[PDB]
C-alpha cells in the first residue's frame, strides 16, 4: 500500500549508488571474460 516515510530515504541510495555499482561490476566482468 502506502510506502513508509523512510522509503525515499532508503530506495534512492541503492539505485543511485550500489545498484549502478553492482551492474557496472557485473558488466565489467562480462566484457573481459575469456571463454
Amino acid at each position: 500500500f502506502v510506502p513508509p516515510a523512510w522509503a525515499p530515504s532508503l530506495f534512492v541510495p541503492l539505485t543511485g549508488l550500489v545498484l549502478p555499482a553492482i551492474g557496472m561490476a557485473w558488466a565489467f566482468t562480462y566484457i573481459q571474460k575469456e571463454k
Binding site: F1, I22, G23, A25, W26, Y30, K33
Partner: protein, 222 residues
C-alpha cells in the same frame, strides 16, 4: 539434492548433488555454485542457526519466568556499564571467532575454545547434525516470527500463542496490519511452484539457469 525437496515434484539443481547434508534443493537464485562458497555458507547458516537456538530458548525462558519484553530489555539499568560491556564482548569475540576461523580452516568443524571439535562425550553422527540444522532453521524462522510479532502486535511468544488460541479465525498473520501483504506474499509463494514447473516442462533442453551478478553461472550461458 535429496528425494524430499522444497516443494513436491521438484527437480534438484545440477550443482546440488545431495552430497551435503540438510539439502532440500531450495536454491532458486543459485548463490552456491562453488564448493568453498557453499562450505562457508553452510558454516554461516550453522552459526546463524545455533545462535538462533540460543536466542529462542533464552527468550522463551525469560517469558516463562516473568522477565520483561526482550526488544525493550536493552534500556533497563544493568550492572556493568554498557560501553565496557561492549568492549569486553569485542575482546572475547576477537579471540573466539579467530579460533573458530582457524579451526574451520584446519578442521572444518564448528569447534570452540581450544578443542576442535568440542565433543567431549562423543555424540557426533550425521543424523545428529541433520537434526541440528533442521532445528536451527526452525528456530531462526521462529526468531523472525518473534521479531515480526513484536513490531505490529507488541507481544512476546507466549502472548502471541495466547492470542492465537483466544480467537484463531480473526487473530493471525493475515488479519494484522501486514495481513494483506502476507496474503499477497503467500499467494506468490503458492504460485512459484506453478511457474517453475511450467518452465521446467517447457525447458526440455538447454540450461535455463538464472543469470545473476553474484554467481558465475552466466559464464557458460554465453
Amino acid at each position: 539434492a535429496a528425494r524430499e525437496m522444497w516443494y513436491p515434484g521438484a527437480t534438484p539443481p545440477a550443482h546440488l548433488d545431495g552430497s551435503m547434508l540438510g539439502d532440500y534443493g531450495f536454491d532458486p537464485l543459485r548463490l552456491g555454485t562453488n564448493p568453498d562458497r557453499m562450505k562457508w555458507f553452510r558454516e554461516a547458516e550453522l552459526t546463524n542457526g545455533r545462535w538462533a537456538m540460543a536466542a529462542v530458548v533464552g527468550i522463551l525462558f525469560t517469558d516463562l519466568v516473568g522477565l520483561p519484553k526482550w526488544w525493550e530489555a536493552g534500556a533497563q539499568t544493568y550492572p556493568i556499564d554498557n560501553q565496557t560491556l561492549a568492549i569486553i564482548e569485542i575482546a572475547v569475540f576477537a579471540f573466539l571467532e579467530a579460533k573458530r576461523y582457524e579451526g574451520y580452516k584446519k578442521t572444518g568443524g564448528t569447534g570452540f575454545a581450544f578443542f576442535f571439535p568440542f565433543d567431549p562425550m562423543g555424540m557426533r553422527s550425521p543424523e545428529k547434525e541433520l537434526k541440528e540444522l533442521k532445528n536451527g532453521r526452525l528456530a531462526m524462522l521462529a526468531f523472525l516470527g518473534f521479531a515480526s510479532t513484536a513490531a505490529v502486535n507488541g507481544q512476546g511468544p507466549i502472548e502471541s500463542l495466547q492470542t492465537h488460541l483466544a480467537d484463531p479465525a480473526h487473530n493471525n498473520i493475515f488479519t494484522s496490519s501486514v495481513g494483506k501483504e502476507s496474503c499477497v506474499f503467500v499467494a506468490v509463494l503458492s504460485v512459484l511452484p506453478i511457474i517453475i514447473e511450467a518452465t521446467k516442462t517447457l525447458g526440455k533442453g538447454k540450461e535455463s539457469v538464472p543469470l545473476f551478478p553474484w554467481n558465475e553461472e552466466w559464464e557458460k550461458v554465453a
